[PDB]
Amino acid sequence: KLRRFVVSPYDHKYRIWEAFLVVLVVYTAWVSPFEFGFLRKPRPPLSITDNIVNAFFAIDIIMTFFVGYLDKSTYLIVDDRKQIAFKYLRSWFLLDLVSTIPSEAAMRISSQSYGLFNMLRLWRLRRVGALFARLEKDRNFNYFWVRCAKLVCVTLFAVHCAACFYYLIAARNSNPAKTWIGANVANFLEESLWMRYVTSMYWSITTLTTVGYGDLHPVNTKEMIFDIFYMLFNLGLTAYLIGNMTNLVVHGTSRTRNFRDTIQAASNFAHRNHLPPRLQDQMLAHLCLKYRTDSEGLQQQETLDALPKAIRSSISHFLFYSLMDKVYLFRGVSNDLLFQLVSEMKAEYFPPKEDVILQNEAPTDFYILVNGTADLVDVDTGTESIVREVKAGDIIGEIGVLCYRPQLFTVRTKRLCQLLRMNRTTFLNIIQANVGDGTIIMNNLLQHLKEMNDPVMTNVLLEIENMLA
């Protein structure tokens, strides 16, 4: 909400009027050069429908005294009346007023101004450029076709205004039979205005595209000099289009590059030894997944790190705080302190049949599995049978990090599973803050090892109570 009698620039009513002036700009982008080159007085069929547009643009220059502008240093939308004006007047108000006087006025001060005056209205093209500069940054718009539509209007405009100048040079020549157009057609000054405009637009397009048939070409020095600069412009413009379409091509298929070679090199190597298909599908299943889970990890990690911990601690508080109470070890801890743990649990992804935590782990971190099924196995004499199959809700690596011993087992994954992480020194640093809970997680830690009837890991239970001793 803003002050009375002020419209915000982001209003939808407004932004649907702004996009309507752009079609009026494409209109003057055509008519202004065409009048400059082909006309000398405001003839009716175009004077009428040009004083109209000079009202829709007069309406606008007053309708930006009631339009707030987003301040930049404070990102506030200014709605101070006497401050909007002083910014307008200081920036554009002069031009936008000058480029709206009807041509019939400038005619009265000097008959020789119709052409040049109407060329001032090309100042309105600043709205087209401001529009394109916004669409590329938008996300609901294909960056390809937006970058292509801007290349089209640029080259359609240069082709058109060049044709209008190069005809002007021939029209205001002293005697016309020595012009570039007077060479072919005898009396081009009597031909229809549609023929003349098509001819010059056709010379212009075949010089820009470097076809250069050579039927129409400069004949005297005035024309040769304009052409020298036109042909130079096109050399840069052409190199600019080719450079822009290469970048739209080699940077549109720039990801699938190092994902096909590998898949190729995979089955390539596979068929150099024609090993059975029962595993062909098995490995490529992992090749694609491990490409997925790292893309997902990378994207999530990058967006999560670019946010303040006052907000990122609301995502990691909305995704996990529910299943952070079913963990057997945190049952009974103060509700607030648990918030501090959930705020710091970097969720990592994992492709199936991979080892998250291996035997004799240096005590670094313990995980929490939010979804998927992981299975437990220990190493002994080189034969390893499954121990347990932990699924969503339980904790693994939980002991060795607490009692500062090497981790006792090794966890593997069966499906692509997502796991939380918790470095030891952080989780350790958190408890010494609120020590009023640091005892509670210790007993229900122990009550865990007693609620289980496993004999050889309750072995790992008695030597810790002499650690208590």
- Return binding residues: 329-450
* Encoded tokens for 314: 């609301």
Q: Which is nearer to K ion, 210 or 220 (CB)?
A: 210
In the complex, minimum distance from the CB of residue 272 to ligand POV, in angstroms, rounded to a whole number: 24
Which of 67, 131, 168, 205 touches its own copies by CB under 8 A? Answer: 205
Question: Nearest approach, Cβ of 231 to K ion (angstroms)?
Answer: 11
Number of chain residues interacting with ligand POV (CB under 6 A):
20
User: Reduced to 3 states, what is the DSSP secondary structure of residue 20?
Assistant: helix
> Which residues between 235 and 294 bind ligand POV (CB under 6 A)?
236-237, 240, 252
Alpha helices in 209-333 (DSSP H): 221-250, 257-271, 277-305, 309-318
CA 75/CA 95 separation, integer angstroms: 27
Number of residues that bind its own copies (CB under 8 A): 136
Q: Does 30 contact ligand POV by CB under 6 A?
A: yes
Phi, psi values for residue 77, rounded to 5°: -85, 105
Instruction: Considering only residues 305 through 324, tell me which ones interact with its own copies, judged by CB under 8 A.
Output: 306-311, 313-315, 318-319
Q: Give the residue with the Cβ less far from ligand POV, 240 or 328.
A: 240
Residues 6+ apart with CB under 8 A from 72: none
Residue 433 in the binding site for its own copies (CB under 8 A)? yes
CB of 45 to ligand POV, least distance (A): 18
Contact 361, 424 (CB under 8 A): no
Report the alpha-carbon distance of residue 80 to residue 78 in Å, rounded.
Answer: 6
Minimum CB separation from ligand POV for residue 30, in Å? 4
| Least distance from K ion to the Cβ atom of residue 37, Å | 25
- Pairing verdict, β 410-413 and 395-396: unpaired
d(CA 468, CA 445): 13
Distance (Å, rounded) from C-alpha 399 to C-alpha 347? 20
Give the number of other CB atoms < 10 A from CB of residue 54: 17
Scanning 9-17, 205-213, 232-240, 451-459 for contacts with ligand POV by CB under 6 A, the matching segment is 232-240
**398 near its own copies, rule: CB under 8 A:** no
Is 124 a binding residue for ligand POV by CB under 6 A? The answer is no
Q: Which helix (H) or strand (E) holds 410?
A: strand 410-413
- Is 44 exposed, middle or buried, given 0-12, 13-18 or 19+ CB atoms closer than 10 A? exposed
User: Binding site membership for a nucleoside 3',5'-cyclic phosphate: which residues?
Assistant: 329-450
CB 372, CB 356: distance < 8 Å: no
Nearest to 283 by CA among 298, 297, 301, 266: 266
Residue 412's nearest CA partner among 386, 393, 392 is: 386
Per CB under 6 A, 128 contacts ligand POV: yes
The option from ligand POV, K ion, its own copies, none interacting with 287 (CB < 5 to 8 A, set by class) reads its own copies
SS3 call for 114? helix
The residue of the chain with the least Cβ separation from K ion equals 210
**157 lies in the site for ligand POV, by CB under 6 A:** yes
| The one segment of 206-214, 265-273, 310-318, 437-445 that binds K ion by CB under 5 A | 206-214
Output 164 or 401, the one with its CB closest to ligand POV: 164
Distance separating alpha carbons of residues 294 and 296, to the nearest angstrom: 5
Return the DSSP state at 7: B
Distance CA 118, CA 39 (A): 11
* Of the candidate residues 82, 380, 451, 455, the single one contacting its own copies (CB under 8 A): 380
Q: Which is nearer to ligand POV, 163 or 356 (CB)?
A: 163
Residues numbered 28 to 87 that lie near its own copies (CB under 8 A) are 73-76
Give residues in contact with ligand POV (CB under 6 A).
26, 29-30, 125, 128-129, 132, 150, 152-154, 156-157, 160, 232-233, 236-237, 240, 252
Contacting residues toward K ion, per CB under 5 A? 210, 212, 214
